[PDB]
Design goal:
This is part of a larger assembly, with chains A (about 140 residues), B (about 180 residues), C (about 60 residues), D (about 110 residues), E (about 80 residues) and F (about 50 residues).
Chain D: H1 2-7, H2 10-19, E1 23-28, E2 33-38, E3 45-50, H3 54-57, H4 64-79, E4 87-89, H5 98-108
Parallel strand pairs in D: 1-4
Antiparallel strand pairs in D: 1-2, 2-3
Helix pairs in contact in D: 4-5
Chain E: E1 21-22, E2 29-30, E3 35-38, E4 45-46, E5 50-52, E6 58-60, E7 64-71, E8 76-82
Parallel strand pairs in E: 4-8
Antiparallel strand pairs in E: 1-3, 2-7, 3-6, 5-6, 7-8
Chain F: E1 2-8, E2 15-20, E3 30-35, E4 40-48
Antiparallel strand pairs in F: 1-2, 1-4, 3-4
Classes of the chains: A alpha+beta (about 140), B alpha+beta (about 180), C mainly beta (about 60), D alpha+beta (about 110), E mainly beta (about 80), F mainly beta (about 50).
Chain B binds six RNA strands through strand 1, strand 2, strand 3, strand 4 and strand 5.
GO molecular function (chain B): rRNA binding; structural constituent of ribosome; tRNA binding
Organism (chain B): Psychrobacter urativorans
Keywords (chain B): Ribonucleoprotein, Ribosomal protein, RNA-binding, rRNA-binding, tRNA-binding
Chain lengths: ~140, ~180, ~60, ~110, ~80, ~50
RNA sequence: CGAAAGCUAUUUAGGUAGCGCCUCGGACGAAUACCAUUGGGGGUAGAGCACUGUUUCGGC
RNA sequence: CCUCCUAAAGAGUAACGGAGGAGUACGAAGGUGCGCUCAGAACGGUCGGAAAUCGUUCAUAGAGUAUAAAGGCAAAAGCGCGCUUAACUGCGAGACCCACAAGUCGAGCAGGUACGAAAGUAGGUCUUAGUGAUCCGGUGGUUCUGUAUGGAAGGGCCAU
RNA sequence: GCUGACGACCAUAGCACGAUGGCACCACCUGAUCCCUUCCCGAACUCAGAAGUGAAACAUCGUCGCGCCAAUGGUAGUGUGGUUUCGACCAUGUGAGAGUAGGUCAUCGUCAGCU
RNA sequence: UUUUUUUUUUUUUUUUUUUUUUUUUUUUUUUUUUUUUUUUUUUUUUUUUUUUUUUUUUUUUUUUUUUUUUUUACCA
RNA sequence: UUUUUU
RNA sequence: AUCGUAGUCCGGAUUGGAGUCUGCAACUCGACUCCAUGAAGUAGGAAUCGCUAGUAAUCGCGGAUCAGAAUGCCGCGGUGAAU
C-alpha cells in the first residue's frame, strides 16, 4: 500500500486529468513494460494488487519497477452526511494516469513469462493496457 | 622586537633559500597572533570572565576584548550576546615580542612538554596550540590567582601551504615534533 | 594602539641562570629587583628554565 | 580593498545620480590623487585635475598639500568650464586627510557644494 | 454519519482585496503625482522621474511617458517617466 | 501601553499625545517638540492624560 | 423605449437603501464601439524540477 | 481585520471551500551620518563535545528582517556606533481605491529643527493586520457667542 | 599599444585553468611622529613615504572543462466558428516549455597619463 | 457525534510561568522482633498518551490522533 | 497513652 | 627541637620498580625489605556492645599451630581511670 511520507497539505483540489503522457511513456528501467492506453486514477490498492500478481509470477528471478506512485489524497464524504460543512476526510491515494504511461516494467526474465505476468497484472487495473518493449528511440 | 629585526635580516633569506622560492614576496611571514580563552561557564558567575580578562591582559600586554555568544545554545546554557570568551590579537611589534617571549621563556614552562605536534597546522600555514595552564607565563604570579585557566595561541601566517607554514615557524626556533 | 587603555609594557631582562643566558624582551611583569645589562638597568627576572636549557633483563640478572 | 571601497561608495553615487547634478568624484592612491567632474548622465568627464599634471607631476605628490593643489586646480577648471554647483563624491574614501583637503580647496576656490 | 469522518476543521477566513498591480502601463501619458504601481516590496524599482512611497508605491515625479525596462546588474524591473 | 500627554513648558497649553510602557519607562519623559503657538521647539514634559 | 434577479450595507437574508442595469428631458459632439498597425505589465493553459516538498531505481 | 490559495497571467470575484495569523510592540526597535555583512560546512586549536569562544578556507543569503504569510531586501529594508526628536506644525499639485461613510500614496511650498563637511535625508518603524462611526460626558486651549446691559453660566471652534 | 577614473550594458559579459605585465599607472610594500583609526589590534580606516616585488591582487591575452545563450523542425496549449463517442477532432489564426544542431572567454562611450 | 475536562513514578494525586519534576502509598536495603506485623532509618523511581510544530531550550506554546470523564444528540 | 499474630 | 590545624611532616590502602628468605617450587596464591605513589578517612544514621579496680582504656612482649605464612587464639607484664 504505497502512500506518501509526510506531506505538505492534507487535502487537495480535484483537478483535471487531461492530455497525453509525454513524460513517463518510455520503458526506461527494465526491458519490458505495461503501458496505459486510457486515462484515469490508479488507486494504491490497485498498484499493490498488480505488484503482488507480477511478483508472484516472476518468482524472485527478475526485477519489477513501478512508475506510478499514489501522491494525490482523495477525500470521501461518509454516508448520511449532508452537503457542505467542510471538505471530507482523506480516505485513499491515487496516481493520475494519462494515455501512454508506463505502469510497471520487468527485466531479467523470459519474454513469454514477462508477457503473461503483465497480462495478469493488467486484469487488476482500471485501464485498457498495451504491452511494450524497451526501444532505443 | 628583536625577533622582527632578526627575521628582517636572517630568517627571511634563510626561508627563501630553504623553500627554494624565486621571489622575496613568496616567503611566509606571521601576520598576527590571537590569544583566546573560552570562558563558556561564565554568564552564570561573571567573575571567571573578570579573571580571564585580567590574565589575558597580563599575558599579552594588551587589553583584550570580551567575545559574546554568536548564537543561542541550550546545551551550553548560553543565550545570544552573552559574554562567553575573551580574545586579543597582536600584530607587528607586539606579536613579535610576544612570540619571542613565548618561545624563549614560557614554552619550556609547560609541564611535561616533549614537543608540539607538527600536524596541528590547519592546512594553510596557520598554527594553533593550547596552553592548559596559564601560569607558564611569568607575568601571572602564583600568589594571587583565581584558578588554573587555559588559552589558545593561534599563529596566523602569510603562508599558503602547510610546509611553508612549518618552515617559517621552525625558522624562529619553534619546538616541534 | 589606543592611548592609556593597555597595561604597562616595559623591557624586562629575563635571565636563565642555569646556562646564564639573558633574554631582553618587553613584558608586563613587574620584577622586584633591577640588574644592569650592557645598556641601562632593566627589571631583572630570574628563570629556572628557558629555551637554552630545556631538553634483556633476564640476561642482566 | 577596492571592492569594499566601491561597495561603500555606491549609496552616495546613486543618490547623486538621483539628484541629477554635476558630481565631483575623487580618487586617491598611495602615490597620486585625482579629481574629475562627471555630468548628471554619469558618462562624460567635463573637467579633471590630478597630480599627473605637469605642474605638479615632478613634485611631492601623495600629500595633503598635493591634494590641496589638485582641488585648487579643479576648482579653476570647473569655473572655466561652466560648472559652479557640484555634489561631492568621496568615492568610498573617508572624508578626511587628502580627500578633505582636496574638497576644501575646491570649495574655497570657487566650487560651491 | 456512519464512518466517523466528518469533523471540525475551521478555516473560513480571508482578508479583503488590496487592488494592487500596474496602474499606468508603458507608453502612456502621465502627470506628476499619478500612481504607476501598487505593490508589496519592490517588484518594480523607481528609475528616473518616478518616486517610491512608504508602501513601495511608485508614482510619477514629473509629467511625461511611462517606460518599463529591465536594467542594472540585478536584472531588476524599473519604471521610468521619460519627458516625452 | 498607557496614553500620556507631553505638554509644552512654554505655558501655551499645547500638548502632544502618545503611549508609553510604564514598566520600562517609569519616569516622566521630556522631548523637544515644535510648539505651534510660539512657533518654536521647546521641551514638552510628560503629563497625565 | 425597455430591465434586474448583481455589488455594498443592514436585528439583514422573501424588507430596504446607495451604486450598477431601464426610461424621459437637457447639455455636449465623436471624446464611444468594431478592425489594422503598434507601446506595455503579467505568472494562467502548457511545461519543468532550478527552490519548497514528494517519488522510484542504480552507484556511493 | 491581515497573508496564501480557490481566482480562469490587469482589478475584482463565492461556498458551513483548503491553510495560517491579528485585537500588539518600540523614545529606540524612530531620524541622520558613518561603518559592517549572514547561515552553514571543512581543517587546526585547553578544559570543550555533534554543537560555546578563537584562527583559516569555501559560501547571493542555503541567514536575518519584533511578529503570520506573501511579496521584497546589497545603495542592503539585515547588523553595529555617535549625535539626536521629522513619531514636527500649517498644508498639499496629483493620483489609487471607493455606493456612501471611510481608506491609501504623494512630490512640492512656508515655518521650526535633527544629523551630515556637504549635495542632502527625515511628516515614525521593509510593506501589507494591531481596529470602532455618531450621540453623550470629561479634560487642555481659544475671543467666537453670551436672552435688557456688563459679566458669568451654557454653547461653538481647535486638541484630546 | 598600455594603464587608471567614471559610465553604457548586466553571463554570448560569468567561473575555472594557463601565460604575460612593472619604464608611466596600479597593487602590494616601509613606518606609525603627526591627522585619523581599533568595543583589543596601523587588519581595515588614516597619515608620512619610496628600500623591495609583480608573489598575491589586478589588467590583458588564450581555451569550451563548467556555466550561460540558442535555432530549425515537431509537439503541447490556445482565440474564433463547427463537430464530438467529452478523450478529442476539423477549419482558420497563433504557438511554447523541454530537448537537439549550434554560439560564447563580450561590445561600446567620455577623460587623463606613459609609449 | 458535539462542546467542555483532562492524560506525568507501582498506584492515586501536585506542578509548570518555555529554562526543573512532586507528595502519599508502595518497592528495595537497613534496624528493632524468637520470627512476622507495626514502627524507625536509608534509598530508588518519571520518552510528563502519542504525533507533527514554535523556540536556543516545551511535560508547559500551537496542531493532530488516542484513552478518560462529563453534557448534549431535538421536530416531524 | 499505644504489646497484632504464631 | 620541629611541625601549628592543613586532607597536612595526619592516615598508609592501592599501584609501579628492585630485592631478601623459606621451600622441589612464591603465576594463580607467601612474609618481609627498600624507593616511588599516596585512596578513603576530618569522629560516623536508625540502632547496638563490653566493662564495678589493678578493672575499663591504652602500651608493648611471648607462645601453640608452624619449612614459610596472625590484625585471630592463648598468655605476660607497663601505665592506669570514671561512676
Amino acid at each position: 500500500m504505497l502512500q506518501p511520507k509526510r506531506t505538505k497539505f492534507r487535502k487537495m483540489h480535484k483537478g483535471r486529468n487531461t492530455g497525453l503522457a509525454h513524460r513517463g511513456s518510455t520503458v526506461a528501467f527494465g526491458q519490458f513494460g505495461l503501458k496505459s492506453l486510457t486515462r484515469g486514477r490508479m488507486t494504491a490498492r490497485q498498484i499493490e494488487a498488480a505488484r503482488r500478481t507480477i511478483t508472484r509470477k516472476i518468482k524472485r528471478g527478475g526485477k519489477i519497477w513501478i512508475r506510478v506512485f499514489p501522491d494525490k489524497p482523495i477525500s470521501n464524504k461518509p454516508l448520511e452526511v449532508r452537503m457542505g460543512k467542510g471538505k471530507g476526510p482523506v480516505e485513499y491515494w491515487v496516481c493520475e494516469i494519462k494515455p501512454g504511461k508506463m505502469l510497471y516494467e520487468l527485466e531479467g526474465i523470459s519474454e513469454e513469462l514477462a508477457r503473461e505476468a503483465l497480462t495478469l497484472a493488467a486484469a487488476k487495473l482500471p485501464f485498457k493496457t498495451t504491452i511494450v518493449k524497451r526501444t532505443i528511440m | 622586537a628583536r625577533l622582527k629585526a632578526l627575521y628582517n635580516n636572517e630568517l627571511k633569506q634563510k626561508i627563501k633559500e630553504e623553500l627554494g622560492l624565486d621571489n622575496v614576496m613568496q616567503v611566509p611571514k606571521i601576520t598576527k597572533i590571537t590569544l583566546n580563552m573560552g570562558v563558556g561557564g561564565a554568564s552564570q558567575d561573571k567573575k571567571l570572565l573578570e579573571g580571564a580578562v585580567a590574565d589575558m591582559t597580563a599575558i599579552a600586554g594588551q587589553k583584550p576584548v570580551v567575545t559574546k555568544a554568536r548564537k543561542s545554545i541550550a546545551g551550553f546554557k548560553i543565550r545570544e550576546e552573552w559574554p562567553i570568551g575573551c580574545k586579543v590579537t597582536l600584530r607587528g611589534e607586539q606579536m613579535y615580542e610576544f612570540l619571542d617571549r613565548l618561545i624563549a621563556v614560557a614554552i619550556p614552562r609547560v609541564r611535561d612538554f616533549r614537543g608540539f605536534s607538527p600536524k596541528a597546522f590547519d592546512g594553510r600555514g596557520n598554527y594553533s596550540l593550547g596552553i592548559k595552564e596559564q601560569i607558564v607565563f611569568p607575568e601571572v604570579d602564583f600568589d594571587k590567582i583565581d584558578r588554573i585557566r587555559g588559552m589558545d595561541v593561534t599563529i596566523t601566517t602569510s603562508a599558503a601551504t602547510d610546509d611553508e607554514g612549518r618552515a617559517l615557524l621552525k625558522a624562529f626556533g619553534f619546538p616541534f615534533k | 594602539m589606543r592611548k592609556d587603555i593597555h597595561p604597562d609594557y616595559h623591557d624586562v631582562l629575563f635571565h636563565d641562570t642555569n646556562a646564564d643566558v639573558f633574554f631582553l624582551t618587553r613584558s608586563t611583569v613587574k620584577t622586584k629587583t633591577t640588574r644592569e645589562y650592557e645598556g641601562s638597568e632593566y627589571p631583572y627576572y630570574p628563570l629556572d628554565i628557558s629555551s637554552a636549557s630545556h631538553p634483556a633483563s633476564f640476561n642482566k640478572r | 580593498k577596492k571592492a569594499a571601497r566601491l561597495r561603500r561608495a555606491k549609496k552616495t553615487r546613486a543618490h547623486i545620480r538621483f539628484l541629477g547634478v554635476y558630481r565631483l568624484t575623487v580618487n586617491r592612491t598611495p602615490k597620486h590623487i585625482y579629481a574629475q567632474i562627471i555630468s548628471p548622465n554619469g558618462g562624460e568627464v567635463i573637467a579633471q585635475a590630478s597630480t599627473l599634471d605637469g605642474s605638479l607631476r615632478s613634485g611631492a605628490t601623495g600629500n595633503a598639500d598635493a591634494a590641496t593643489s589638485v582641488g585648487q586646480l579643479i576648482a579653476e577648471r570647473a569655473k572655466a568650464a561652466g560648472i559652479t554647483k557640484v555634489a561631492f563624491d568621496r568615492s568610498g574614501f573617508k572624508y578626511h586627510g587628502r580627500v578633505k583637503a582636496l574638497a576644501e580647496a575646491a570649495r574655497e576656490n570657487g566650487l560651491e557644494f | 454519519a456512519h464512518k466517523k469522518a466528518a469533523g471540525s476543521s475551521r478555516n473560513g477566513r480571508d482578508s479583503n482585496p488590496k487592488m494592487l498591480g500596474v496602474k499606468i502601463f508603458g507608453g502612456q501619458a502621465i502627470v506628476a503625482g499619478n500612481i504607476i504601481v501598487r505593490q508589496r516590496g519592490t517588484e518594480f524599482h523607481a528609475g528616473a522621474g518616478v518616486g517610491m512611497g512608504r508602501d513601495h508605491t511608485l508614482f510619477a515625479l514629473n509629467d511625461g511617458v511611462v517606460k518599463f525596462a529591465t536594467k542594472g546588474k540585478f536584472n531588476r524591473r524599473y519604471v521610468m517617466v521619460e519627458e516625452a | 501601553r498607557d496614553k500620556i500627554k507631553l505638554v509644552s513648558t512654554a505655558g501655551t497649553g499645547y500638548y502632544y499625545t502618545t503611549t508609553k510602557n510604564k514598566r520600562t519607562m517609569p519616569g516622566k519623559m521630556e522631548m523637544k517638540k515644535f510648539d505651534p503657538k510660539i512657533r518654536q521647539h521647546v521641551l514638552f514634559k510628560e503629563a497625565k492624560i
